[PDB]
Amino acid sequence: TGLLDGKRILVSGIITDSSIAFHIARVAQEQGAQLVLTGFDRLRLIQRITDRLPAKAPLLELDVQNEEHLASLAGRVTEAIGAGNKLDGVVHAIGFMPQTGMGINPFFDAPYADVSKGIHISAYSYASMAKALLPIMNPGGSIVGMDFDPSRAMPAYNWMTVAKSALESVNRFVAREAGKYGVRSNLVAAGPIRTLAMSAIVGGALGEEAGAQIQLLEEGWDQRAPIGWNMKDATPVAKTVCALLSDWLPATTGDIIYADGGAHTQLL
Amino acid sequence: TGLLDGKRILVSGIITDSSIAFHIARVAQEQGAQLVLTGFDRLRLIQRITDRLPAKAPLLELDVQNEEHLASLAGRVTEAIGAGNKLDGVVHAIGFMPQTGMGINPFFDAPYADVSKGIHISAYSYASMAKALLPIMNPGGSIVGMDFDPSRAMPAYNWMTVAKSALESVNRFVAREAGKYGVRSNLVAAGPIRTLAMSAIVGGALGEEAGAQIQLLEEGWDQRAPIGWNMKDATPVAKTVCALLSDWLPATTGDIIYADGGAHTQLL
Amino acid sequence: TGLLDGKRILVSGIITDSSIAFHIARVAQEQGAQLVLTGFDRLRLIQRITDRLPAKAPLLELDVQNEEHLASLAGRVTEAIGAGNKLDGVVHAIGFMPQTGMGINPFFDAPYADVSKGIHISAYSYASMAKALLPIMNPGGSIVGMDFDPSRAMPAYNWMTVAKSALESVNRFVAREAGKYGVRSNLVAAGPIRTLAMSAIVGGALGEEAGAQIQLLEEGWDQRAPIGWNMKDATPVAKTVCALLSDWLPATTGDIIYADGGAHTQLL
Amino acid sequence: TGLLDGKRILVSGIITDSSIAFHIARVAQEQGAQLVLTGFDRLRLIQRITDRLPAKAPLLELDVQNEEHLASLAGRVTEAIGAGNKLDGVVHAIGFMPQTGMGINPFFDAPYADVSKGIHISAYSYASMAKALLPIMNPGGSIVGMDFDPSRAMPAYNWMTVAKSALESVNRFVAREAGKYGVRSNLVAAGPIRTLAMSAIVGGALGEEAGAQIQLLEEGWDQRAPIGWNMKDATPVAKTVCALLSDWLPATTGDIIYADGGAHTQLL
């Protein structure tokens, strides 16, 4: 059976088999969910890099900045899951901020064009995935986005934090649209997960000054977290997203679940 | 198979079979948990109630304000669960504020003795129960208290709100103690549930003024909750506690999960 | 005498004489501030309106979306205030959301173009103005923007709420930059004031259907506010901004001061 | 002239001359306020300290744990300020947790009688004084308590933190009551300041480990604070308290002003 047994869940954001979305997809399939995966205009690129999930899953093209991809999402999901089936779950794990908005570009030097793209994909596309999929979501259904607690400013994250503040705000509005469908909308605020993107940042692609800043932020999590924080382990975070996809948090929406080791709840 | 399968879980606070504790225990059992219940005083009267549970559970005595109680709990639990066995969960679902500090009475008119007693039971006993039980908890274990979001003042909850503020703060310190045991500590902040004392609040014993203030409270909650809020139904709360008791929020502690229909995320 | 004696303060966002900006600027002047005003699209109507102010203040053009206006702002402000003088205060009271992102229009129907513009104006420009003006601010300086508590979703406000969420996040990052200059950055989270966007999609008229939600929403401030809320009266919010522009809140930055009658502290 | 000119302000909790409390009174007097002061057992030692204040103030006796002191205070305050004179401000700067609930003693080991006493003095007495004093406050008045951000758990502060959480809640409720008199109630959430029992309770009289763990705690402020935090300067806090005592924050109540260098707004 498993936690998500029977549930039809669309999972966006997988880019690598170390993506938070990939582990979310993984844990979901292990828990019996039936997935529909999405990846940007690169349904063929997500093809190479996800033949690694426990079960096969239809993969669909979605560039969330593409209003056509969005108008047709519901259409192709249905095609994918079977006419007469609906989604039980939607995982939005799409986050992106041009590195001009997050990494060593001064916070002030991030062009709005880039911030705006960061917010399009990171925050707004949450409302657009909700708009696209809510009509093909079952009551008791669950939308989950990925958050990184922006409630305090932090070095390097910069405009991405801004985008996550925006996303949290968007989440409470999604929940209110979502609740007309009996659907809940929540975010999972993850502690830092050193994946493909994060390790190059800390590896100094976005330079010494930002890698340092991220490293020192990211190391504060484990010190802070009463239960610690392994940034190399997406599983706790994937399991939390699946808890949100399950029927075990039936009265939470508009909300944020911290899967951060309890870091956010401790000063030091 | 069940969410909580193979979990040993202490549930405190079942005083009647409608109190969220009862529902927690019930769902916990339906999820495959082996319960140790606590009660104090009317212990033969509490076993009459816990007899209405799906499964037998040892009922131990525990006045949470007391020590031949608290200091002996771990021992008595260990005897109840057996040599070699530890608890995976602790549920604190004890809330008491003398009615002088409740909705009927002016905020300024609650004596400290009563406030103090209400905080002892509702907040400080959370630390007490963690102190008592942590030694006999398994890593990955989970302590959950019951919260009623006190971040905004509400009339006709008065000092109880204050007690829940205190609880929330206690929860975060407990988490930091619990983490040393690999153990989570969280609060489930429930929407308003009618019991036999929060029921006896609205039922008549509060008189017009406090009964109307509480109904205005509870009705706005349903309005606010994007997925709605059912005053009468403890299940969503009970499931949430169980989520928390499960392995599915392994990265959450010091924290609060709002099982409140999302009301706290919406202004109207 | 006067809170703001000797202080030079840039006030942006005066479009009207009822606008929070107008009253901030008036209060600042009554308090002995020397103002610089900025404005954009109807600059001669603006000059008419800034006349209704106790003292004349130069109006400089400033389209916050215009990077060249921004790049030139300090030098114009400086020529306006005389060389060797720097600003002590900056008021950002610019907030705008294309009404696709507000009022009667779905949250889901706002094109991103519109959300992006509103966030540009409402949130990003706060960092823009900080960037433009920090170089010409005195230590002990203050930058204040206008917030509307977006911590909880509400009907109508929609994408403007999201932009206010972004703005609060923007503000904390701006504080971090501003602090280098010994400058504070804070937001005043105002209760609702009727002017030309919390009253021109309001207006007690865009249907007797969902105009009702917003009416419920907005009359909830006065009712929630322990000291009440007067929607017609920008003075208390203007005074709050002035306190932040003063030296009387010298240890507060990256922060939000709620000038809302304490409504957001109260659930009902 | 003066910020608080004409203001009759009662200030409680002056117990050292290095206090936030002592500096609130000093700054209040420098700003024209006529003070009334209160103290309890160490009455010679308090009358000594308050002599260090630039102006004479009546010192009245007030054990906030004493319902006779409280039910009486208003009469004595009137006696000292003169019949038909009301207070315009009340400052609650009474904070005390017995040692077992603070610093080095585990959080777990604090007996409730200590916790209860700390909460009585630190939180409940905020409602006590408001109740004692609201009847003799002017509309336009202002009650201010001293907070220390308890939103996240930190080492050492322990049950003091819990007390602070409770106070924050108490304040929101005080605002309800107070708002019936035209009176605001707010807390100033100060950064760590080094007092007398902070040249003891972190200076050199808790241990070696409680003058380096509270020190490590407290020095993260100045790191985090965008405009910095001087542990030794209670003036920014005293001034913030006076802002709140002034008419410059007329729309804020039930609230918390963070005079903490903006530290709570920033993660690293």
XYZ file of N, CA, C and O in Angstrom, chain A residues 78-229:
608
model
N -4.548 14.595 -17.887
C -5.695 13.738 -18.008
C -5.383 12.643 -19.046
O -5.510 11.465 -18.732
N -4.943 13.037 -20.245
C -4.502 12.071 -21.254
C -3.622 11.033 -20.576
O -3.783 9.823 -20.770
N -2.699 11.527 -19.756
C -1.670 10.694 -19.148
C -2.195 9.739 -18.065
O -1.771 8.549 -17.950
N -3.105 10.252 -17.256
C -3.555 9.484 -16.106
C -4.822 8.744 -16.418
O -5.200 7.858 -15.682
N -5.448 9.104 -17.538
C -6.688 8.474 -17.985
C -7.846 9.416 -17.745
O -8.087 9.845 -16.611
N -8.526 9.749 -18.841
C -9.793 10.476 -18.856
C -10.698 9.916 -17.805
O -10.918 8.718 -17.745
N -11.239 10.769 -16.952
C -12.012 10.216 -15.863
C -11.174 9.975 -14.633
O -11.708 9.643 -13.621
N -9.852 10.137 -14.699
C -9.071 10.136 -13.469
C -8.671 11.538 -13.161
O -8.526 12.339 -14.063
N -8.476 11.836 -11.878
C -7.978 13.146 -11.529
C -6.698 12.982 -10.716
O -6.292 11.843 -10.341
N -6.074 14.123 -10.434
C -4.848 14.108 -9.683
C -5.230 14.180 -8.245
O -6.176 14.832 -7.900
N -4.465 13.525 -7.407
C -4.638 13.713 -5.988
C -3.612 14.660 -5.425
O -3.769 15.116 -4.320
N -2.547 14.917 -6.170
C -1.422 15.600 -5.606
C -0.654 16.248 -6.705
O -0.623 15.782 -7.858
N -0.113 17.390 -6.339
C 0.675 18.202 -7.202
C 1.843 18.712 -6.378
O 1.685 19.309 -5.310
N 3.024 18.453 -6.899
C 4.215 18.832 -6.238
C 4.854 19.821 -7.141
O 5.173 19.532 -8.277
N 4.961 21.034 -6.643
C 5.669 22.035 -7.340
C 7.037 22.128 -6.651
O 7.146 22.649 -5.559
N 8.092 21.592 -7.272
C 9.454 21.782 -6.753
C 10.322 22.533 -7.781
O 11.385 22.115 -8.118
N 9.820 23.652 -8.257
C 10.463 24.437 -9.266
C 10.871 25.733 -8.555
O 10.058 26.449 -7.983
N 12.147 26.012 -8.570
C 12.656 27.188 -7.960
C 13.745 27.674 -8.894
O 14.554 26.920 -9.396
N 13.778 28.950 -9.159
C 14.844 29.405 -9.954
C 14.899 30.917 -9.804
O 13.850 31.620 -9.806
N 16.134 31.373 -9.674
C 16.473 32.747 -9.627
C 17.730 32.924 -10.460
O 18.753 32.379 -10.104
N 17.667 33.719 -11.552
C 18.985 33.975 -12.203
C 20.029 34.287 -11.121
O 19.691 34.918 -10.108
N 21.253 33.777 -11.291
C 22.330 33.908 -10.269
C 22.748 35.372 -9.993
O 23.439 35.686 -9.002
N 22.268 36.234 -10.875
C 22.290 37.682 -10.714
C 21.408 38.187 -9.560
O 21.643 39.277 -9.016
N 20.396 37.377 -9.213
C 19.527 37.621 -8.083
C 19.843 36.798 -6.838
O 19.190 36.960 -5.853
N 20.846 35.923 -6.874
C 21.149 35.081 -5.733
C 22.468 34.342 -5.892
O 22.553 33.367 -6.628
N 23.480 34.769 -5.149
C 24.830 34.240 -5.320
C 25.514 35.571 -5.341
O 24.780 36.564 -5.263
N 26.854 35.641 -5.411
C 27.530 36.973 -5.309
C 27.320 37.927 -6.521
O 28.187 38.211 -7.400
N 26.081 38.399 -6.541
C 25.750 39.687 -7.081
C 25.178 40.391 -5.860
O 24.324 39.842 -5.170
N 25.740 41.546 -5.501
C 25.071 42.339 -4.486
C 23.553 42.324 -4.655
O 23.021 42.316 -5.778
N 22.868 42.237 -3.525
C 21.399 42.246 -3.499
C 20.840 43.398 -4.316
O 19.905 43.227 -5.069
N 21.450 44.558 -4.167
C 21.090 45.708 -4.973
C 21.446 45.577 -6.485
O 20.913 46.341 -7.311
N 22.288 44.630 -6.887
C 22.682 44.666 -8.310
C 21.926 43.692 -9.200
O 22.237 43.554 -10.367
N 20.918 43.047 -8.625
C 20.096 42.083 -9.314
C 19.151 42.899 -10.170
O 18.434 43.722 -9.631
N 19.200 42.726 -11.522
C 18.271 43.411 -12.424
C 16.873 42.935 -12.156
O 16.682 41.770 -11.911
N 15.899 43.828 -12.215
C 14.562 43.396 -12.060
C 14.161 42.330 -13.050
O 13.472 41.351 -12.662
N 14.539 42.503 -14.324
C 14.293 41.436 -15.326
C 14.623 40.031 -14.793
O 13.892 39.043 -15.045
N 15.726 39.935 -14.064
C 16.140 38.640 -13.519
C 15.387 38.231 -12.255
O 15.055 37.036 -12.063
N 15.138 39.212 -11.384
C 14.313 38.971 -10.237
C 12.946 38.526 -10.725
O 12.386 37.535 -10.229
N 12.433 39.237 -11.716
C 11.097 38.963 -12.214
C 10.974 37.575 -12.793
O 9.928 36.902 -12.605
N 12.045 37.109 -13.449
C 12.059 35.753 -13.954
C 12.139 34.781 -12.772
O 11.423 33.759 -12.743
N 13.029 35.062 -11.826
C 13.088 34.268 -10.589
C 11.724 34.113 -9.893
O 11.346 33.038 -9.483
N 10.963 35.186 -9.829
C 9.660 35.176 -9.190
C 8.601 34.492 -10.063
O 7.730 33.768 -9.569
N 8.715 34.681 -11.372
C 7.841 33.969 -12.304
C 7.864 32.476 -12.020
O 6.863 31.921 -11.752
N 9.055 31.887 -12.008
C 9.244 30.468 -11.906
C 9.074 29.964 -10.489
O 8.460 28.913 -10.288
N 9.597 30.715 -9.518
C 9.628 30.328 -8.116
C 8.307 30.524 -7.389
O 7.976 29.785 -6.470
N 7.554 31.548 -7.762
C 6.432 31.923 -6.906
C 5.199 31.888 -7.716
O 4.262 31.148 -7.442
N 5.184 32.726 -8.722
C 4.034 32.782 -9.570
C 3.609 31.436 -10.232
O 2.423 31.123 -10.301
N 4.561 30.635 -10.680
C 4.228 29.377 -11.339
C 3.539 28.428 -10.372
O 2.997 27.411 -10.778
N 3.594 28.748 -9.087
C 2.873 27.957 -8.116
C 1.393 28.244 -8.293
O 0.580 27.335 -8.352
N 1.051 29.509 -8.463
C -0.317 29.888 -8.726
C -0.685 29.352 -10.110
O -1.744 28.847 -10.315
N 0.221 29.451 -11.063
C -0.153 28.887 -12.343
C -0.260 27.378 -12.414
O -1.069 26.880 -13.163
N 0.491 26.643 -11.603
C 0.309 25.190 -11.606
C -0.983 24.869 -10.943
O -1.701 24.017 -11.429
N -1.305 25.606 -9.889
C -2.592 25.460 -9.196
C -3.760 25.800 -10.120
O -4.765 25.096 -10.188
N -3.632 26.884 -10.861
C -4.697 27.235 -11.783
C -4.913 26.138 -12.837
O -6.043 25.826 -13.139
N -3.816 25.593 -13.385
C -3.832 24.559 -14.394
C -4.424 23.257 -13.872
O -5.223 22.598 -14.532
N -4.005 22.858 -12.682
C -4.304 21.518 -12.226
C -5.511 21.432 -11.294
O -5.987 20.356 -11.061
N -5.962 22.546 -10.739
C -6.978 22.444 -9.710
C -8.254 21.849 -10.337
O -8.866 20.968 -9.742
N -8.619 22.292 -11.575
C -9.751 21.685 -12.269
C -9.641 20.185 -12.476
O -10.664 19.572 -12.733
N -8.459 19.590 -12.367
C -8.338 18.152 -12.559
C -7.779 17.491 -11.344
O -7.101 16.441 -11.437
N -8.086 18.113 -10.200
C -7.731 17.586 -8.883
C -8.942 17.123 -8.120
O -9.941 17.828 -8.016
N -8.800 15.967 -7.488
C -9.829 15.422 -6.595
C -9.950 16.161 -5.270
O -8.948 16.568 -4.707
N -11.166 16.255 -4.715
C -11.284 16.651 -3.308
C -10.342 15.783 -2.414
O -10.037 14.632 -2.769
N -9.841 16.363 -1.321
C -8.874 15.710 -0.473
C -7.524 15.810 -1.147
O -6.618 15.220 -0.701
N -7.402 16.602 -2.202
C -6.228 16.646 -3.011
C -5.244 17.571 -2.363
O -5.584 18.253 -1.390
N -4.007 17.579 -2.843
C -2.937 18.319 -2.112
C -1.932 18.892 -3.054
O -1.333 18.189 -3.860
N -1.716 20.198 -2.947
C -0.674 20.818 -3.700
C 0.421 21.151 -2.748
O 0.180 21.739 -1.716
N 1.647 20.775 -3.106
C 2.743 21.147 -2.275
C 3.850 21.824 -3.071
O 4.304 21.315 -4.103
N 4.232 22.996 -2.582
C 5.435 23.672 -3.045
C 6.569 23.550 -2.077
O 6.469 23.057 -0.920
N 7.695 23.968 -2.604
C 8.948 23.878 -1.959
C 9.336 25.256 -1.561
O 9.364 26.193 -2.342
N 9.687 25.367 -0.319
C 10.010 26.644 0.251
C 11.372 26.538 0.910
O 11.901 25.440 1.092
N 11.952 27.708 1.207
C 13.122 27.838 2.012
C 12.821 29.096 2.772
O 12.817 30.212 2.198
N 12.628 28.914 4.067
C 12.182 29.944 4.962
C 12.794 31.320 4.708
O 13.973 31.568 4.995
N 11.976 32.231 4.172
C 12.462 33.573 3.885
C 12.090 34.574 4.933
O 12.171 35.777 4.690
N 11.709 34.111 6.127
C 11.143 35.033 7.047
C 12.263 35.923 7.635
O 11.968 36.944 8.183
N 13.535 35.543 7.526
C 14.631 36.456 7.884
C 15.553 36.564 6.708
O 15.823 35.546 6.028
N 16.143 37.739 6.514
C 17.040 37.833 5.406
C 18.284 36.958 5.649
O 18.691 36.659 6.751
N 18.840 36.461 4.575
C 20.047 35.745 4.745
C 20.963 36.052 3.577
O 20.508 36.176 2.440
N 22.279 36.105 3.854
C 23.273 36.334 2.807
C 23.146 35.329 1.673
O 22.841 34.158 1.876
N 23.398 35.820 0.478
C 23.581 35.002 -0.756
C 22.267 34.594 -1.390
O 22.098 34.810 -2.626
N 21.341 34.043 -0.570
C 19.987 33.701 -1.067
C 19.271 34.900 -1.705
O 18.590 34.814 -2.708
N 19.520 36.060 -1.136
C 19.094 37.310 -1.679
C 17.711 37.312 -2.263
O 16.730 37.103 -1.574
N 17.638 37.604 -3.553
C 16.381 37.650 -4.215
C 15.625 36.356 -4.299
O 14.444 36.379 -4.531
N 16.302 35.227 -4.170
C 15.592 33.961 -4.085
C 14.730 33.887 -2.790
O 13.764 33.152 -2.738
N 15.141 34.588 -1.754
C 14.450 34.613 -0.478
C 13.245 35.464 -0.721
O 12.179 35.153 -0.266
N 13.415 36.514 -1.505
C 12.344 37.365 -1.804
C 11.304 36.536 -2.541
O 10.137 36.602 -2.269
N 11.732 35.827 -3.575
C 10.842 34.954 -4.315
C 10.127 33.937 -3.384
O 9.027 33.508 -3.701
N 10.803 33.445 -2.340
C 10.201 32.438 -1.473
C 9.212 33.150 -0.528
O 8.160 32.597 -0.213
N 9.538 34.369 -0.088
C 8.528 35.169 0.593
C 7.330 35.308 -0.251
O 6.217 35.137 0.257
N 7.517 35.709 -1.512
C 6.393 35.809 -2.447
C 5.623 34.473 -2.595
O 4.431 34.470 -2.669
N 6.344 33.355 -2.673
C 5.765 32.051 -2.863
C 4.880 31.698 -1.688
O 3.822 31.122 -1.851
N 5.297 32.108 -0.494
C 4.525 31.768 0.729
C 3.245 32.529 0.709
O 2.223 32.028 1.044
N 3.329 33.751 0.228
C 2.183 34.559 0.061
C 1.230 33.984 -0.996
O 0.010 33.838 -0.744
N 1.781 33.674 -2.165
C 1.075 32.944 -3.221
C 0.435 31.627 -2.721
O -0.718 31.347 -2.998
N 1.199 30.819 -2.012
C 0.602 29.676 -1.328
C -0.684 29.950 -0.518
O -1.573 29.146 -0.550
N -0.799 31.055 0.212
C -2.011 31.271 1.026
C -3.164 31.643 0.090
O -4.336 31.318 0.345
N -2.824 32.357 -0.982
C -3.854 32.602 -2.025
C -4.211 31.368 -2.821
O -5.344 31.068 -3.010
N -3.236 30.571 -3.205
C -3.570 29.290 -3.811
C -4.495 28.491 -2.906
O -5.466 27.956 -3.410
N -4.276 28.468 -1.578
C -5.014 27.581 -0.706
C -6.450 27.960 -0.724
O -7.375 27.117 -0.597
N -6.662 29.245 -0.851
C -8.024 29.731 -0.828
C -8.766 29.402 -2.145
O -9.899 29.024 -2.131
N -8.065 29.437 -3.266
C -8.594 28.932 -4.541
C -8.707 27.416 -4.463
O -9.693 26.825 -4.857
N -7.659 26.795 -3.931
C -7.624 25.350 -3.788
C -8.734 24.795 -2.922
O -9.278 23.784 -3.267
N -9.131 25.482 -1.854
C -10.099 24.928 -0.915
C -11.499 24.800 -1.559
O -12.339 24.085 -1.059
N -11.732 25.458 -2.684
C -13.032 25.346 -3.364
C -13.105 23.977 -4.045
O -14.179 23.467 -4.371
N -11.946 23.391 -4.275
C -11.844 22.080 -4.776
C -11.658 21.017 -3.718
O -11.568 19.849 -4.072
N -11.574 21.403 -2.443
C -11.361 20.429 -1.340
C -9.916 20.092 -1.415
O -9.498 18.975 -1.047
N -9.131 21.031 -1.954
C -7.741 20.729 -2.225
C -6.935 21.578 -1.279
O -7.270 22.753 -1.048
N -5.906 21.000 -0.685
C -5.063 21.861 0.082
C -3.767 22.280 -0.570
O -3.355 21.679 -1.536
N -3.231 23.412 -0.120
C -2.017 23.950 -0.702
C -1.099 24.250 0.448
O -1.482 24.942 1.330
N 0.066 23.626 0.455
C 1.069 23.878 1.442
C 2.445 23.910 0.871
O 2.725 23.370 -0.206
N 3.340 24.518 1.642
C 4.741 24.564 1.240
C 5.487 23.770 2.177
O 5.109 23.730 3.329
N 6.574 23.138 1.715
C 7.493 22.509 2.623
C 8.745 23.374 2.646
O 9.475 23.440 1.643
N 8.977 24.035 3.786
C 10.206 24.760 3.989
C 11.293 23.825 4.402
O 11.278 23.290 5.496
N 12.214 23.600 3.460
C 13.243 22.645 3.626
C 14.422 23.439 4.195
O 14.629 24.601 3.887
N 15.200 22.793 5.028
C 16.554 23.247 5.246
C 17.351 23.151 3.986
O 16.898 22.553 3.013
N 18.584 23.693 3.990
C 19.358 23.651 2.739
C 19.719 22.207 2.333
O 19.994 21.320 3.163
N 19.605 21.937 1.068
C 19.833 20.587 0.577
C 20.952 20.808 -0.414
O 20.776 21.531 -1.389
N 22.121 20.255 -0.136
C 23.206 20.437 -1.064
C 23.058 19.407 -2.144
O 23.429 18.253 -1.948
N 22.497 19.847 -3.279
C 22.266 19.004 -4.472
C 23.306 19.220 -5.605
O 24.538 19.315 -5.360
N 22.815 19.265 -6.846
C 23.681 19.595 -7.976
C 23.963 21.109 -7.956
O 25.140 21.520 -7.921
N 22.899 21.921 -7.937
C 23.049 23.393 -7.909
C 23.836 23.946 -6.676
O 24.811 24.708 -6.843
N 23.439 23.519 -5.470
C 23.993 24.062 -4.217
C 25.511 23.807 -4.025
O 26.240 24.710 -3.599
N 25.967 22.590 -4.355
C 27.398 22.203 -4.225
C 28.372 22.940 -5.168
O 29.536 23.144 -4.807
N 27.905 23.314 -6.367
C 28.687 24.178 -7.281
C 28.748 25.617 -6.746
O 29.817 26.218 -6.722
N 27.600 26.137 -6.294
C 27.552 27.415 -5.548
C 28.617 27.456 -4.416
O 29.514 28.336 -4.427
N 28.523 26.488 -3.485
C 29.506 26.315 -2.393
C 30.899 25.911 -2.916
O 31.929 26.240 -2.280
N 30.917 25.205 -4.059
C 32.158 24.869 -4.797
C 32.805 26.060 -5.514
O 33.939 25.976 -6.000
N 32.075 27.175 -5.576
C 32.646 28.456 -5.990
C 32.386 28.897 -7.418
O 33.069 29.803 -7.890
N 31.420 28.251 -8.096
C 30.879 28.667 -9.418
C 30.283 30.064 -9.349
O 30.481 30.884 -10.209
N 29.490 30.282 -8.322
C 29.029 31.598 -7.904
C 29.955 31.722 -6.721
O 29.844 30.897 -5.766
N 30.849 32.718 -6.805
C 32.216 32.666 -6.278
C 32.566 32.268 -4.847
O 31.738 31.784 -4.095
N 33.829 32.475 -4.492
C 34.340 32.291 -3.129
C 33.449 32.961 -2.059
O 33.071 32.333 -1.114
N 33.134 34.243 -2.238
C 32.345 35.051 -1.295
C 30.923 34.472 -1.066
O 30.484 34.290 0.072
N 30.236 34.097 -2.135
C 28.947 33.419 -1.999
C 29.010 31.962 -1.528
O 28.091 31.504 -0.853
N 30.035 31.220 -1.925
C 30.087 29.833 -1.517
C 30.264 29.792 -0.007
O 29.594 29.017 0.665
N 31.207 30.613 0.476
C 31.494 30.896 1.875
C 30.201 31.261 2.601
O 29.866 30.611 3.564
N 29.469 32.277 2.120
C 28.245 32.765 2.747
C 27.237 31.628 2.884
O 26.805 31.327 3.972
N 26.899 30.972 1.779
C 26.086 29.724 1.775
C 26.618 28.626 2.698
O 25.875 28.037 3.472
N 27.907 28.329 2.610
C 28.455 27.342 3.508
C 28.178 27.661 5.007
O 27.730 26.811 5.764
N 28.475 28.883 5.425
C 28.273 29.329 6.790
C 26.785 29.398 7.162
O 26.426 28.994 8.258
N 25.917 29.882 6.266
C 24.464 29.715 6.494
C 24.117 28.265 6.674
O 23.514 27.871 7.663
N 24.490 27.472 5.692
C 24.057 26.105 5.656
C 24.576 25.280 6.806
O 23.906 24.343 7.229
N 25.727 25.644 7.355
C 26.278 24.937 8.497
C 25.543 25.332 9.807
O 25.490 24.545 10.778
N 24.993 26.546 9.845
C 24.186 26.948 10.998
C 22.940 26.078 11.191
O 22.472 25.981 12.288
N 22.432 25.434 10.133
C 21.246 24.614 10.246
C 21.421 23.469 11.165
O 20.573 23.251 12.046
N 22.478 22.701 10.936
C 22.716 21.550 11.762
C 22.990 21.904 13.230
O 22.550 21.221 14.132
N 23.726 22.984 13.453
C 23.955 23.522 14.792
C 22.616 23.923 15.427
O 22.382 23.651 16.606
N 21.781 24.624 14.649
C 20.440 25.064 15.093
C 19.434 23.955 15.290
O 18.767 23.913 16.317
N 19.298 23.090 14.298
C 18.299 22.048 14.361
C 18.424 21.185 15.611
O 19.416 20.543 15.801
N 17.386 21.166 16.456
C 17.436 20.279 17.607
C 17.704 18.825 17.178
O 18.406 18.066 17.888
N 17.186 18.427 16.016
C 17.440 17.069 15.572
C 18.563 17.041 14.521
O 18.840 15.996 13.956
N 19.243 18.172 14.327
C 20.284 18.256 13.317
C 19.682 18.455 11.933
O 18.481 18.401 11.738
N 20.565 18.690 10.982
C 20.225 18.863 9.594
C 21.358 18.266 8.746
O 22.481 18.749 8.816
